[PDB]
Amino acid sequence: DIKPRIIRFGYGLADDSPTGKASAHFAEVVSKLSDGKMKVKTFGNGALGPDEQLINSLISGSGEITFVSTAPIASLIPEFGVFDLPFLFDNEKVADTVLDGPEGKKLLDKLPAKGLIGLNYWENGFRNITNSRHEISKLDDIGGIKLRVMQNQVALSVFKGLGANAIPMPFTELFTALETKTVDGQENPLSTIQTSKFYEVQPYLTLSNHVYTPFVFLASKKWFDQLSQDEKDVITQAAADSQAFQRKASRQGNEDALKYLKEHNVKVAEFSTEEREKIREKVAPIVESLKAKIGKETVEGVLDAAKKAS
Numbered sequence: 652d653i654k655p656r657i658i659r660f661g662y663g664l665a666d667d668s669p670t671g672k673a674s675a676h677f678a679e680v681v682s683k684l685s686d687g688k689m690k691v692k693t694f695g696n697g698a699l700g701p702d703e704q705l706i707n708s709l710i711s712g713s714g715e716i717t718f719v720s721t722a723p724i725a726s727l728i729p730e731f732g733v734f735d736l737p738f739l740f741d742n743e744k745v746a747d748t749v750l751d752g753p754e755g756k757k758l759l760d761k762l763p764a765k766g767l768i769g770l771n772y773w774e775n776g777f778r779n780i781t782n783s784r785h786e787i788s789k790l791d792d793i794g795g796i797k798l799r800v801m802q803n804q805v806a807l808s809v810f811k812g813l814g815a816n817a818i819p820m821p822f823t824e825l826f827t828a829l830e831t832k833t834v835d836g837q838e839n840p841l842s843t844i845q846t847s848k849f850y851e852v853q854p855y856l857t858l859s860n861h862v863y864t865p866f867v868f869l870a871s872k873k874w875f876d877q878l879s880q881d882e883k884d885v886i887t888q889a890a891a892d893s894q895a896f897q898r899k900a901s902r903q904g905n906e907d908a909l910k911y912l913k914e915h916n917v918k919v920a921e922f923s924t925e926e927r928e929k930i931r932e933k934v935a936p937i938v939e940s941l942k943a944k945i946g947k948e949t950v951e952g953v954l955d956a957a958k959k960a961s
């Protein structure tokens with residue numbers, strides 16, 4: 652029961668990013684599993700707008716598939732704000748375990764009420780601080796830095812508490828704001844810093860790995876529900892295949908990215924063990940207040956699953 656369909660897949664990152672190549676890989680798998688009847692068209696690099704617009708496109712049905720960071724979803728479902736808390740996951744293996752486990756599914760299950768199907772989680776990654784004003788190797792260096800953040804009360808509160816002037820902006824506007832120094836800097840994973848070319852206008856990189864961002868791989872519930880079960884099965888099966896492809900490609904891209912940023916002579920700093928301690932204690936009281944905005948059951952449950960995974 653598989654009829655010809657044309658399926659629109661917009662996203663924010665560059666086509667050459669690991670997740671952009673995973674998007675093409677998803678397109679290829681969907682076609683294979685449907686004998687060429689289901690054809691995914693990808694529109695990368697923000698061609699169909701930033702995350703916030705992609706989410707709305709899926710709700711309304713102008714788009715079929717996207718991947719977005721969890722932060723913008725907090726505007727619909729506050730519990731998704733949990734992943735903007737710093738230092739939640741020690742490594743990617745903890746993240747996978749938690750996201751693919753009951754605490755991750757509890758959140759994905761909140762999406763149909765809002766018109767969305769969370770097919771699964773993909774990896775955006777550990778985020779690192781880039782700027783153009785000065786090296787950031789100490790908590791103190793963050794003070795008064797005009798830092799773009801993702802558009803969520805949790806991101807804004809955390810970085811304001813670390814002393815920065817936190818400027819929420821959509822990702823599609825970020826490059827020009829860095830280039831024009833309307834903002835001093837930003838924080839993203841290395842392979843995004845590379846493939847969106849932020850390093851061209853950001854001479855400083857700090858390997859802070861301060862937050863882990865999941866992507867949600869999403870379908871429009873309106874569109875998905877009118878598929879036949881055989882058609883749904885092509886999508887979910889392709890999504891499981893692409894999740895594994897995406898996570899491997901993300902991790903390898905993270906390694907290639909640091910080399911390219913290094914071998915390209917970007918100035919890379921780290922936070923000391925001590926400075927990282929200072930960071931955690933500055934954020935502690937703010938994380939505690941944000942629980943009320945996120946959802947105390949979600950924060951505590953994610954922390955407990957992270958602990959057992961770890």
Ligand SMILES: O=C(O)[C@H](O)[C@H](O)[C@H](O)[C@@H](O)CO
Pocket residue numbers: 662663664701702718719720721775801821822838839864
């Ligand atoms: O900095 C951000 O907003 C995010 O890390 C990503 O750029 C964003 O989730 C997506 O647009 C990526 O496709």
